[PDB]
Amino acid sequence: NKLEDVVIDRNLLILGKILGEGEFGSVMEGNLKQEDGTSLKVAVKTMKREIEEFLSEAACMKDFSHPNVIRLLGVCIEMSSPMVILPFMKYGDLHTYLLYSRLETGPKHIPLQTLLKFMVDIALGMEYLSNRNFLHRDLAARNCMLRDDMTVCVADFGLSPVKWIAIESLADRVYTSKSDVWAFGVTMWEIATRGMTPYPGVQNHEMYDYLLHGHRLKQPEDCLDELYEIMYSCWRTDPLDRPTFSVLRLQLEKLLESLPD
Ligand SMILES: CC(C)n1cnc2/c(=N/c3cccc(Cl)c3)nc(NCCO)[nH]c21
């Protein structure tokens, strides 16, 4: 009964062209009409019956307030005869941006300093979420968006991927914010490599055993050992040994300082 204001009136909302389709749902561009009278550019995620439970998640998420975490604006429901509403991000997802940057006509070559900023942002977003005791469960560069001012924020959290999952979750189904810390390490690598799929040579079905024998992602070509140490700490076998997001965040910030201007 309480979280019912999270719901937005379907006619306040107008949908446009499709921006992508995964097996789950489809993401669309649209316009949301506001209190102002003004309209705001939004992105609309669709998915597919004990449903109340889902609504509470959106209610929770709506409470999130951090510049490095996306703000869910509300939800719509077209009656089964459910769509989440998020601010539109014109620069798109971080993964596709890294790839574009390796091409002419696309964004200039991202220098090291900017690659670190990217990671700091995500570290910060995850710091905040880890404090709220919120478990992400799908962190990857494809799920990090670029703001109009080139800030990175975290998106797609939860909503009900093998190469991003930590050993213990792969094995026992267990998942804690340390498992997210594992995903973050993989994400960092994605950025260091400017969009390589993790574990080249290793097929998905081999992943668990490849990790079980203590094998990790390899160090990228011209990567500082410091940066590599940091990402590697994210994948220590015991979750307890892995650093926390606030421990990580500060390491990246101090490293960024260490680099020339
Ligand atoms: C659902 C949330 C996270 N969201 C918010 N904005 C976007 C988004 N924006 C853009 C921006 C530039 C080009 C395109 Cl195709 C989509 N794209 C996507 N996805 C399309 C490519 O990954 N998702 C977006």
Numbering used by the authors: 575 to 622, 629 to 661, 667 to 745, 763 to 863
Copy text from the publication.
To determine the mode of binding of these compounds, inhibitors were co-crystallized, and a complex structure was determined with C52, a ligand developed from combinatorial synthesis of 2,6,9-trisubstituted purines. C52 bound co-planar with ATP of the Mer–ATP complex, occupying the adenine and sugar pockets and having good shape-complimentarity to this region of the pocket; its isoproply group fills the space formed between Ala617, Lys619, Met730, Asp741, and Leu671 and its ethanolamine moiety binds in the groove formed between Leu593 and Val601. The hydroxyl group of C52 hydrogen-bonds to the carboxylate of Asp678 and the carbonyl oxygen of Arg727. In addition, hydrogen bonds are present between (1) the purine N7 nitrogen and the backbone nitrogen of Met674, (2) the ligand’s aniline nitrogen and the carbonyl of Met674, and (3) the ligand and the carboxylic group of Asp678; one via a water molecule. Complementary, van der Waals interactions also form between the chloro-phenyl ring of C52 and backbone atoms of the hinge region (residues 674–676). Compared with the nucleotide-bound complex, the N-terminal lobe of the C52 complex is rotated (about 5°) relative to and is more closely associated with the C-terminal, helical lobe. For example, the distance between the tertiary carbon atom of Val601 and the sulfur atom of Met730 is 1.0 Å less in the C52 complex structure. Retaining its DFG-Asp-in and αC-Glu-out conformation, C52 draws the entire N-lobe, including αC, towards the hinge region (674–676), causing relocation of the aliphatic DFGL-Leu744. As a potential site for the development of inhibitor specificity, the N9 isopropyl group of C52 points towards Ile650, which is one of the few positions of the nucleotide binding pocket that is divergent among the Axl members (Axl, Mer, and Sky).
